[PDB]
Short mmCIF file of C-alpha atoms in Angstrom, two decimals:
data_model
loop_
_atom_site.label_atom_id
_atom_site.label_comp_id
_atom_site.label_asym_id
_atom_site.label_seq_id
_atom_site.Cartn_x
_atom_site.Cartn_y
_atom_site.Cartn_z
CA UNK E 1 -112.67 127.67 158.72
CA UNK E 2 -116.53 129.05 158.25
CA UNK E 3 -118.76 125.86 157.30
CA UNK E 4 -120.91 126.83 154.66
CA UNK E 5 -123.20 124.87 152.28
CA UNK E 6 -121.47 124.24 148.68
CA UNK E 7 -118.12 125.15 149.40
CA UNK E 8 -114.94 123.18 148.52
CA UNK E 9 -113.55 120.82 150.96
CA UNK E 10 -110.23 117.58 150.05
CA UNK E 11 -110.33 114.54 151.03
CA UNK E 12 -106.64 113.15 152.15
CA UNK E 13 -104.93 115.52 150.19
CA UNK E 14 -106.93 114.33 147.06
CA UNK E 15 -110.31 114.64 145.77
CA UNK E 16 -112.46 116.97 145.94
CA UNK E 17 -116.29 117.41 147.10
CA UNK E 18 -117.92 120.01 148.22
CA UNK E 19 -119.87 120.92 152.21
CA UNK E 20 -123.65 119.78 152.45
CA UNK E 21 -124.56 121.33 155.71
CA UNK E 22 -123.37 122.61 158.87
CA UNK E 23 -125.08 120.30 161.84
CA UNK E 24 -124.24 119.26 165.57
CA UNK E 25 -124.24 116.15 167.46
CA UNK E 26 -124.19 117.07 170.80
CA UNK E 27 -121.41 119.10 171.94
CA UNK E 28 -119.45 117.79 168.53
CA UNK E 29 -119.72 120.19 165.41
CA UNK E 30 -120.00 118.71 161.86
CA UNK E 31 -120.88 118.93 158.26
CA UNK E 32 -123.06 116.46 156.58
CA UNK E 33 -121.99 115.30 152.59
CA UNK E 34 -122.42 112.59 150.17
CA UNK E 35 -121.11 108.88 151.34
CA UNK E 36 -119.11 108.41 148.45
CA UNK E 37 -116.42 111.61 148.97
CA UNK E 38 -114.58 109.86 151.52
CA UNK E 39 -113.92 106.35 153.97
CA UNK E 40 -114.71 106.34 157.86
CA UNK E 41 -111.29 108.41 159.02
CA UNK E 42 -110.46 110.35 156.10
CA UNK E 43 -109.14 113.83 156.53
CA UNK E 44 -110.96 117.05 155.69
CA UNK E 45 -109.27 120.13 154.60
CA UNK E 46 -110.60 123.70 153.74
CA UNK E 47 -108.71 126.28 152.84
CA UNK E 48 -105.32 124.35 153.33
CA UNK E 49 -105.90 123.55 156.87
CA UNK E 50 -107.24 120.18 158.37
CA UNK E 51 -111.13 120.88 159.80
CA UNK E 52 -112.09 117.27 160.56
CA UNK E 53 -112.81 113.41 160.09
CA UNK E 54 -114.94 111.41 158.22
CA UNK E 55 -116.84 109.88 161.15
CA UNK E 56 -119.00 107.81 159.24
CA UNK E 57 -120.72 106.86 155.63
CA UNK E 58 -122.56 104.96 153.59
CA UNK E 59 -122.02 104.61 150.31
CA UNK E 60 -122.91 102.88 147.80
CA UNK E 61 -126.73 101.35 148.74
CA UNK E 62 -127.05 104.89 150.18
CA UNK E 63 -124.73 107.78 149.31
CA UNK E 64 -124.43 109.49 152.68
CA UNK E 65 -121.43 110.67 155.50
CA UNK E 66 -120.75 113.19 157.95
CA UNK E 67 -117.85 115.21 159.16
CA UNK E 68 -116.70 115.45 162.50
CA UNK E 69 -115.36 118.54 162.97
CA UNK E 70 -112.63 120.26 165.29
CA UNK E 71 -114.60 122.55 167.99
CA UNK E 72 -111.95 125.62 166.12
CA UNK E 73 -114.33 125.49 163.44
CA UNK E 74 -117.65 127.97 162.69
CA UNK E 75 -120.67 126.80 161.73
CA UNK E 76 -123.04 128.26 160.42
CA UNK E 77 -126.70 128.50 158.86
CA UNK E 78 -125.94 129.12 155.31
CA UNK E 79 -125.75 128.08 151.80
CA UNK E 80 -123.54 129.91 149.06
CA UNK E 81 -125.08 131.36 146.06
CA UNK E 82 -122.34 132.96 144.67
CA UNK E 83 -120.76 136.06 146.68
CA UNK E 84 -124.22 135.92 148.56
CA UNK E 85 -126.23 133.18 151.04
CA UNK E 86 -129.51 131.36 151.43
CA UNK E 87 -130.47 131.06 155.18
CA UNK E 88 -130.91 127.63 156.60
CA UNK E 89 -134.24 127.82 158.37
CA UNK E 90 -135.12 124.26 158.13
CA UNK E 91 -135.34 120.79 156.72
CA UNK E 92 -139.00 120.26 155.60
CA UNK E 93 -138.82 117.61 152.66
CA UNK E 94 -140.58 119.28 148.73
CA UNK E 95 -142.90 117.53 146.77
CA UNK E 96 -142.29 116.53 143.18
CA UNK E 97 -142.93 119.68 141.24
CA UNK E 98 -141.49 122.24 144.01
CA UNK E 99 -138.49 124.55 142.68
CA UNK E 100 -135.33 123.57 144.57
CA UNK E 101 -131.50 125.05 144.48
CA UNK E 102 -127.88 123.20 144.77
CA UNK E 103 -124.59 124.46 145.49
CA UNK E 104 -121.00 123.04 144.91
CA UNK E 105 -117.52 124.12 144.28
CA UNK E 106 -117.58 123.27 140.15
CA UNK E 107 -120.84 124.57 138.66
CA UNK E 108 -122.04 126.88 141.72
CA UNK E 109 -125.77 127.87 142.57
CA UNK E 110 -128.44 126.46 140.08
CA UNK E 111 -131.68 125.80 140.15
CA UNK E 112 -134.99 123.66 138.83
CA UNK E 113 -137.43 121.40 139.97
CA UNK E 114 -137.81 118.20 141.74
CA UNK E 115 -138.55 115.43 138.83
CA UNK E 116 -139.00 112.09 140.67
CA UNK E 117 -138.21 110.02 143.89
CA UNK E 118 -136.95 107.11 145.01
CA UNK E 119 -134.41 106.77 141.59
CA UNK E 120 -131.70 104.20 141.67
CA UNK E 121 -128.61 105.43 139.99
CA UNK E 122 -125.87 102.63 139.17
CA UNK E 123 -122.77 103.78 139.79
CA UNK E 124 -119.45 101.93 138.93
CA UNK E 125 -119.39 101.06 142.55
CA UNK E 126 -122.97 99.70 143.05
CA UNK E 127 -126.64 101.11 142.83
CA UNK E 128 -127.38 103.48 145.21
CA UNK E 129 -131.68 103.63 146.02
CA UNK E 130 -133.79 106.07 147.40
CA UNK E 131 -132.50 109.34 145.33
CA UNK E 132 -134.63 112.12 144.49
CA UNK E 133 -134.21 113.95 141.19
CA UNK E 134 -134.26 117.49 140.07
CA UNK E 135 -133.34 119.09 136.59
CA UNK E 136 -130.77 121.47 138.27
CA UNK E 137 -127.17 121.24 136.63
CA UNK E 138 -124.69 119.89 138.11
CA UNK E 139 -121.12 118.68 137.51
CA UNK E 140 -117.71 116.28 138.66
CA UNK E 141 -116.87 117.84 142.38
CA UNK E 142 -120.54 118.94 143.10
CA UNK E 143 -121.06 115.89 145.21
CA UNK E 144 -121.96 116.60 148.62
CA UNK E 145 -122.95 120.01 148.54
CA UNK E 146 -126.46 121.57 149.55
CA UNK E 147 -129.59 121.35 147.82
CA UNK E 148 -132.03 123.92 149.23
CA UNK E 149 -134.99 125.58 148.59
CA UNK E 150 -135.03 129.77 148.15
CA UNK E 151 -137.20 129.82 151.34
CA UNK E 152 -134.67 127.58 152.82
CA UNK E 153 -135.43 124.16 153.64
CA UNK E 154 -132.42 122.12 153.51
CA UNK E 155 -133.08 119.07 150.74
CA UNK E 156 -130.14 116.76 150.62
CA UNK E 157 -127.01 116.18 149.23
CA UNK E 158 -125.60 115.94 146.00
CA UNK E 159 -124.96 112.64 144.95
CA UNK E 160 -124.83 111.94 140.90
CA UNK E 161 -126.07 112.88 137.68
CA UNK E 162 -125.88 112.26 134.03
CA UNK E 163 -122.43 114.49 133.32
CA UNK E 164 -121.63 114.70 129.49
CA UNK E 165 -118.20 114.87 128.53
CA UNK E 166 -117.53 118.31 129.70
CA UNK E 167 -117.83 116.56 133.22
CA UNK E 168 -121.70 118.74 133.66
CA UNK E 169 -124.81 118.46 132.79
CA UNK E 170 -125.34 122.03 132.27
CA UNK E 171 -124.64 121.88 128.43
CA UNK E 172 -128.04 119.93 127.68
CA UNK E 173 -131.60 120.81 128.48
CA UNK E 174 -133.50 120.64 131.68
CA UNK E 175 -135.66 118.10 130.35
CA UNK E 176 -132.59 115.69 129.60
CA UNK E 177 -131.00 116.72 132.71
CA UNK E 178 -130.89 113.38 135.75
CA UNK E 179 -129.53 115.16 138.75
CA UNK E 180 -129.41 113.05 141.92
CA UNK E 181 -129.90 113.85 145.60
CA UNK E 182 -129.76 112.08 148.93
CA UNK E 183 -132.46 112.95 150.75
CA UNK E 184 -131.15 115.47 154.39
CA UNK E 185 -134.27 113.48 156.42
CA UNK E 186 -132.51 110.12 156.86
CA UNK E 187 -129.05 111.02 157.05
CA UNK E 188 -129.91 113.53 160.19
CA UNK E 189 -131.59 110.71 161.61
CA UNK E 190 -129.44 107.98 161.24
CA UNK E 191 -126.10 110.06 162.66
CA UNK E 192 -128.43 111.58 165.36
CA UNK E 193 -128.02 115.25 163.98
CA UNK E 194 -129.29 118.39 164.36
CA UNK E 195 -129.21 120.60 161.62
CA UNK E 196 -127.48 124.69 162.26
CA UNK E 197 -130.66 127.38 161.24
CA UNK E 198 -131.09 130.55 160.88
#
């Protein structure tokens, strides 16, 4: 399969979450995504075909994994915004204030702006620290995918949000809107990652 930013990927046959980025360690391809879309092991599919391995996470405390690919699949610098792509050039960390992008496999490409950092959201499974926060929509199955700026600079991955009952937040405001990323920075570090630009 081609490993691009946003798009839909199962875990064991069963949920859903959608690709972060496309990175390498070493001579092994990957994807980085959010902790909480899969267990150490688990098996990624695309496009009805198995692509990879979780290899590791963390999740809750943090909300972070990556994906350890077969060396079949393509990766590549890119983001989907609908039929289109944004260009991975990068991974230089916003301010609060700065316009940012996400992509994922229920509510697509949307944008806003960076609200806040360092937000604890408590999930059902724990609190998870460290999470910045935009006012892009998001909804159920986004997790994982890419937020990006337009100029390119990889963000983070989606982690959580404040879904109505519609399973988005895209039917409310921008100023009611909590949507939560884990910051790209530590997870690249921590898995000893590169990150795929263009």
């Amino acid at each position: 399969a081609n490993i691009v930013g946003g798009i839909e990927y199962s875990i064991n046959n069963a949920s859903l979450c959608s690709v972060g980025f496309s990175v390498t360690r070493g001579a092994t391809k990957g994807f980085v995504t959010a902790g909480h879309c899969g267990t150490v092991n688990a098996t990624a599919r695309i496009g009805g075909a198995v692509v990879g391995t979780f290899a590791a996470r963390v999740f809750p405390g943090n909300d972070r994994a990556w994906v350890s690919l077969t060396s079949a699949q393509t990766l590549l610098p890119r983001v989907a915004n609908g039929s289109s792509f944004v260009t991975v050039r990068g991974s230089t960390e916003a301010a609060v204030g700065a316009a940012v992008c996400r992509s994922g496999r229920t509510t697509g490409y949307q944008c806003g702006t960076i609200t806040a950092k360092n937000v604890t959201a408590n999930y059902a499974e724990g609190a998870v620290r460290g999470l910045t926060q935009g006012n892009a929509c998001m909804g159920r199955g986004d997790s994982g995918g890419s937020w990006i700026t337009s100029a390119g600079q990889a963000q983070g991955v989606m982690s959580g949000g404040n879904v109505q009952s519609n399973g988005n937040n895209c039917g409310i405001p921008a100023s009611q809107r909590s949507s939560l990323f884990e910051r790209l920075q530590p997870i690249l570090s921590q898995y000893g990652l590169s990150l795929v630009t263009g």
